[PDB]
Amino acid sequence: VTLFVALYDYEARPNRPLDLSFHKGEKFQILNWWHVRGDWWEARSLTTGETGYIPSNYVAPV
Amino acid sequence: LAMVDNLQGDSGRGYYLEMLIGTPPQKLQILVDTGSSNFAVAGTPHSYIDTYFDTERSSTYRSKGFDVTVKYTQGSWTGFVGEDLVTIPKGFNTSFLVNIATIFESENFFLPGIKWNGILGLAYATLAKPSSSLETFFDSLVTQANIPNVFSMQMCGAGNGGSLVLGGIEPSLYKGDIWYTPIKEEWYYQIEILKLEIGGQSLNLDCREYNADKAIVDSGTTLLRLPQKVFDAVVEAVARASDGFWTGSQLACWTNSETPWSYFPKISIYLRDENSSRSFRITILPQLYIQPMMYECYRFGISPSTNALVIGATVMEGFYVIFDRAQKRVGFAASPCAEIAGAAVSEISGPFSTEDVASNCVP
């Protein structure tokens, strides 16, 4: 699995600067699996092109 | 006398201990880190943290009049150095005056998903910043409570938490004989590594390369980190017994819940026993090095390192590690909680010969 598809629409909270805000159906590329810690993964959105953290439960594999 | 306290979290996020600081006591989540010697907490509100330690709200806080900057592998912070009372809930009934660093500014330290808001430095005084003169949490605990200079760890994060015994060993947390490896350098928890085996077959490298800069045991680090020259040979050896899975750029998913562990070999680390002529073996099954994410997807739990060889929380999840600071040795024993639904994930064997092995491996 290389890419991850967004299952639900997520709006990042203002107090969370490294959190990615995404729409349902958005594709992501997880940077490094070695730096993965918990239910929040540092991914790269294919729509916006920005680097940030996404909730693991909100995404599905491709 | 020993304080047996319950640990929360897993190998991934990091094992954290609950602490009460100051008067009135402030409940904070403190990560157990054996790769550092500084007891630091968040002193200001920050992103990705629910609570922090307010020095102005504590009547027992005494400012030491200075601050220190500490850099990590991926993270840095600057915090006010002072001293306050620390009481561990389920543990000891009495409070202790220890050195505390209150973080006011940080770069990539408090990350998302992380449940802790503080760090517990359990290594030797020489590593502690600013200097060795600043007494570590355990050194102040050993002096005040008059407890043996020994602390043991038991990690149970197979996929509840753990147990940190401050002041000795609890025999119920292990099975079999404890195999002790001497601490060569009293800074980090540096132990002598002589050989590495992959499913029976052993790779060939000068034993001085296994101790690259230092071969340490760290609770803070998640995966087993190997040096750049060593990591490459391991990747080649496992591949012969087993696309961007090895480079950590991709995963490896196996359909209909069938375990990939049968396809993967066994990784064994050879450590020099107290008796110079003999050495023991710490074996980790693929259950600990092929970590499950989220029918289910799996990642490679081995990463290269620029400087040192780190025996992370993934390897420590299988063994009951004893940090005997009083006798300059690190203990290893089979853990009962280190079993995925009855099936064992770790193997400890010995004694083995060092006759056709180099006299000294620490360069």
UniProtKB/Swiss-Prot annotation, chain B:
Its EC number is 3.4.23.45. Residues 15-333 form the Peptidase A1 domain. Keywords: Aspartyl protease, Autocatalytic cleavage, Cell membrane, Disulfide bond, Endoplasmic reticulum, Endosome, Glycoprotein, Golgi apparatus, Hydrolase, Membrane, Protease, Signal, Transmembrane, Transmembrane helix, Zymogen. GO terms for cellular component: endoplasmic reticulum; endosome; Golgi apparatus; melanosome membrane; membrane; plasma membrane; trans-Golgi network. GO terms for biological process: amyloid-beta metabolic process; glucose homeostasis; melanosome organization; membrane protein ectodomain proteolysis; negative regulation of amyloid precursor protein biosynthetic process; peptide hormone processing; protein processing; proteolysis. It is a single-pass type I membrane protein. The keyword Glycoprotein applies. Undergoes autoproteolytic cleavage. Monomer. Interacts with RTN3 and RTN4. Belongs to the peptidase A1 family. This is Beta-secretase 2. It comes from Homo sapiens (Human). The chain holds residues 78 to 459 of 518 of the full protein.
